[PDB]
Design a protein around this ligand. Structure first.
Ligand SMILES: CC(=O)SCCNC(=O)CCNC(=O)[C@H](O)C(C)(C)COP(=O)(O)OP(=O)(O)OC[C@H]1O[C@@H](n2cnc3c(N)ncnc32)[C@H](O)[C@@H]1OP(=O)(O)O
Lengths: 180, 668
């Protein structure tokens, strides 16, 4: 009830740092972003013991609800990090993008990247031949402040790119296609 | 006065050089390009351009028939091919002259005259240069090997009458090992390729490669310019050259310059070209070869002679005499040139890389620096062409000023998107043997006997690198806290007086404590006190810092939240992982899991039909090299290699249909 009430009012971030079973597995479904730790965190309702007892299927803990499954195939986890220390370091960086509440404007931070510079690298990215793919990320990185881009679900639904970046100090969200 | 319109039959910086000179002269310049070079710099700089053909050069820059069509289509009067492609192609010059188009370069007589080694040696004998005699006969006896050497000279080489690759070769100096070398080769060589006839000739020790340039005149005149020292090379291609050698005094320069002219005036070489000499440790100069074409080492002599070689070649081709006399040619200072390639210097000294350029900034704000480049940001470098990026030329009043300015230009020279060879150039020019001049044509092979490893840091340099990396780390941490104030939710900046860091380099972990005093960070690195002062503009590709009075330029190439930073320091990229004290103390509890690097296994990223495979087993593969193309959904998905090597097996062929995850090619 609180997680639903807070939706659209305050950001809700849930980082999974270990196994999660039963009803607990639904709270990340109500928050805004879910992150995991590779080979350490799990998300499932029932364990492999129930799957084997109910149906004639063979599965292990990692296959059923491991971080790799949820960041690559089911689309449940927004990103997995290698270990606990790196996971929290990236979480601090992610935090700095978001406002404290929905009543606040997108945060604006000190920026040294001139807002009026040109990016000549863009003129030749897009081929004239219609059947030749190009990497959309090259455009995104060249436009955003200081070439910093935070990519969400890098391994899931690769044909569309979404993520956070700053332009002239202000946090923006970026959505685009990946022709590759 | 001069030509109204000149066509250039080349691409890249050499085409740019001609376009700039023509514009200075008021001459319209026509460019040619392939379909992939349509957006290259020389195409945009030229006044008119004609597309000739597709990406491979054999159909675009060596297609003389398509070029002839472009020459007449634009009503060009003269053609300047630069170097490389059709500069020595006689059939091109013949069919070009047949149409009364002025060719800028050698005529076909000079090209054929030096066509082979026999005519070149005969010219050196007639022009009277050197070409040291050998033995015009077969050595048969045990005493002939030494008796003949006694009549001609001292350093004597024994080699097979025909063959190579060590086919009984030995180097001898005195008579005892000359006799021994012959009899060994004459009795064992018969067991290799069935031939035991030995010849003797004369050799030199630690050679230096020295060029002298000559400017020919159609009226019979010819002048010689200052020499070039071209000893730093890999895979028989030069990378660094110096103009005002060091191995010559005033008399030697005149003596050798006159001989280079004697060659040019005896074949009537009314063009610009180069004569190559080898000099031994005793300052004995021997003829090596005569070249007919503007060399790639012509932008370093110009900085001390004050000439413009392209301007002069165009007037000579029009029919004007040389504008100078020999008494006016002198050394006005010193100039050194470095060639920058898109190559990995670690992989057997220069393995080509493939890629696109995302950041590019030439050091043109520094004194005494001239950058001659054919690329612009958003340029691609590919397997079809020699991976040249630029030629960096630095000049000064003395040898130390030109070298110091070169060192500065290399650290302020931004190339990102490809792998480059700046680390190699930055270390060679500062090598104690290079500064003193003890350089031979095999210099790099003795300095780096196990390959290129990168710049090696000493104690003080490690302390400066640690202090810079630690201060830059904190500078980002402080910038992260400066928000516009939100009147609803006050933000309180943490009062962090000291930053306690654990800074891991290669295999060592250092203890660093930093504090901020405004623009300067006071950093203690394992007990050593350093003060790093800067403006700390964190967006610029070039960050200028002063560490205890020492001026450094560094580049931060990448940053991660986990503390990983990639910092280029003195040309070499160092990997440093900066954790806070707390993160480093707890990180020891993490399991050191290691995964497999399966970069040799190239699988299809997308289902569809295979339309091209660029390889067969044994083919060389560069990083980023296209291997396979799979087409579906009206799109061609190019699959590239992530590993340098050769192909071991090609599993899917063109015409085959593959799914997602199927194996296409397997590398060694
Ligand atoms: C249908 C629903 O949605 S309701 C789901 C109900 N959920 C549960 O009760 C838990 C599910 N099953 C389990 O207990 C599993 O063991 C899981 C989910 C806890 C995962 O197991 P593991 O990660 O291996 O932890 P493990 O059970 O080995 O931990 C052992 C210790 O944890 C405690 N523990 C383990 N499971 C439970 C549990 N279900 N309830 C309370 N304590 C538990 C025990 O006290 C035990 O003590 P010990 O330290 O002496 O061993």
């Amino acid at each position: 009830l609180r997680n639903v009430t807070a939706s659209g009012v305050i950001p809700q971030i849930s980082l999974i740092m270990g196994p999660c079973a039963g009803g607990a597995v639904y709270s990340p479904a109500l928050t805004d972003f879910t992150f995991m730790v590779k080979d350490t965190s799990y998300l499932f309702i029932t364990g492999p013991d129930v799957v084997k007892s109910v149906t004639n299927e063979d599965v292990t803990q990692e296959e059923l609800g491991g971080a790799k499954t949820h960041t690559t195939m089911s689309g449940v986890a927004h990103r997995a990090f290698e270990n606990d220390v790196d996971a929290l370091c990236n979480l601090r960086d992610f935090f700095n993008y978001l406002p404290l509440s929905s009543q606040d404007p997108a945060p604006v931070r000190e920026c040294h990247d001139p807002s009026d510079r040109l990016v000549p690298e863009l003129d030749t990215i897009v081929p004239l031949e219609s059947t030749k793919a190009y990497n959309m990320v090259d455009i995104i990185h060249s436009v955003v402040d200081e070439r910093e881009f935070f990519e969400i679900m890098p391994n899931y639904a690769k044909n569309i790119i979404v993520g956070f970046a700053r332009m002239n100090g202000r946090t923006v969200g970026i959505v685009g296609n990946q022709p590759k | 006065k001069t030509f109204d319109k000149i066509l250039v039959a080349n691409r890249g910086e050499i085409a740019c050089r001609v376009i700039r000179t023509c514009k200075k002269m008021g001459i319209k310049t026509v460019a040619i390009h392939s379909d992939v070079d349509a957006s290259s710099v020389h195409v945009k700089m030229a006044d008119e351009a004609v597309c000739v053909g597709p990406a491979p050069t054999s159909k675009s820059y060596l297609n003389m028939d398509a070029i002839m069509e472009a020459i007449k289509k634009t009503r060009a009067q003269a053609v300047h091919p630069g170097y490389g492609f059709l500069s020595e192609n006689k059939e091109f010059a013949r069919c070009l002259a047949a149409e009364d188009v002025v060719f800028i370069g050698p005529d076909t007589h000079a090209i054929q005259a030096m066509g082979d080694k026999i005519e070149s040696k005969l010219l050196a004998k007639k022009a009277e240069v050197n070409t040291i005699p050998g033995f015009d006969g077969v050595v048969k006896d045990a005493e002939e090997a030494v008796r003949i050497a006694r009549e001609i000279g001292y350093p004597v080489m024994i080699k097979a009458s025909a063959g190579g690759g060590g086919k009984g070769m030995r180097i001898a100096w005195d008579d005892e090992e000359t006799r021994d070398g012959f009899r060994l080769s004459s009795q064992e060589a018969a067991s290799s390729f069935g031939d035991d006839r030995l010849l003797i000739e004369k050799f030199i020790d630690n050679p230096r490669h020295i060029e002298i340039q000559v400017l020919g005149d159609k009226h019979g005149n010819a002048l010689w310019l200052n020499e070039r020292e071209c000893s730093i090379q890999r895979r028989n291609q030069k990378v660094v050259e110096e103009a005002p050698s060091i191995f010559l005094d005033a008399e030697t320069r005149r003596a050798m310059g006159e001989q280079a002219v004697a060659l040019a005036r005896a074949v009537k070489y009314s063009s610009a070209g180069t004569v190559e000499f080898l000099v031994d440790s005793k300052k004995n100069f021997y003829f090596l070869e005569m070249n007919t074409r503007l060399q790639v080492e012509h932008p370093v002599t110009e900085c001390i002679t004050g000439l413009d070689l392209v301007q002069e070649m165009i007037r000579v081709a029009k029919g004007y005499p040389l504008r100078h006399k020999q008494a006016d040619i002198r050394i006005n200072g010193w100039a050194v040139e470095c060639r920058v390639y898109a190559e990995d210097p670690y992989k057997s000294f220069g393995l080509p890389s493939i890629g696109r350029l995302s950041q590019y900034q030439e050091p043109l704000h520094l004194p005494g620096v001239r950058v001659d480049s054919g690329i612009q940001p958003g340029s691609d470098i590919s397997i079809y062409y020699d991976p040249m990026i630029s030629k960096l030329i630095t000049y000064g009043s003395d040898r130390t000023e030109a070298l110091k300015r070169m060192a500065d230009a290399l650290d302020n020279y931004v190339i990102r998107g490809v792998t480059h060879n700046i680390a190699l150039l930055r270390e060679v020019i500062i090598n104690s043997r290079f500064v003193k001049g003890d350089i031979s044509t095999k210099f790099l092979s003795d300095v780096y006997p196990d390959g290129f490893k990168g710049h090696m840091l000493t104690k003080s340099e490690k302390n400066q690198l640690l202090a810079i990396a630690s201060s830059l780390f904190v500078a980002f941490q402080l910038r992260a806290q400066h928000f516009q104030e939100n009147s609803r939710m006050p933000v309180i900046k943490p009062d962090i007086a000291n930053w306690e860091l654990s800074v891991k380099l290669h295999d060592k972990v250092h203890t660093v404590v930093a504090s901020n005093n405004g623009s300067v960070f006071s950093v203690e690195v394992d007990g050593s006190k350093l003060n790093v002062t800067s403006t700390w503009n964190l967006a610029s590709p070039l960050l200028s810092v002063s560490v205890d009075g020492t001026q450094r330029t560094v580049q931060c190439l990448s940053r991660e939240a986990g503390g990983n930073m990639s910092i280029q320091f003195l040309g070499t990229v160092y990997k440093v992982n900066i954790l806070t004290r707390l993160a480093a103390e707890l990180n020891k509890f993490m399991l050191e899991k290691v995964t497999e690097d399966t970069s040799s296994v190239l699988r299809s990223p997308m289902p569809g039909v295979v339309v091209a495979v660029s390889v067969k087993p044994g083919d060389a593969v560069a990083e980023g090299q296209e291997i396979c193309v799979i087409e579906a959904m009206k799109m061609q998905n190019s699959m590239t290699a992530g590993k340098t090597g050769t192909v071991k097996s090609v599993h899917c062929q063109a015409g085959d249909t593959v799914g997602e995850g199927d194996l296409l090619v397997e590398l060694e």
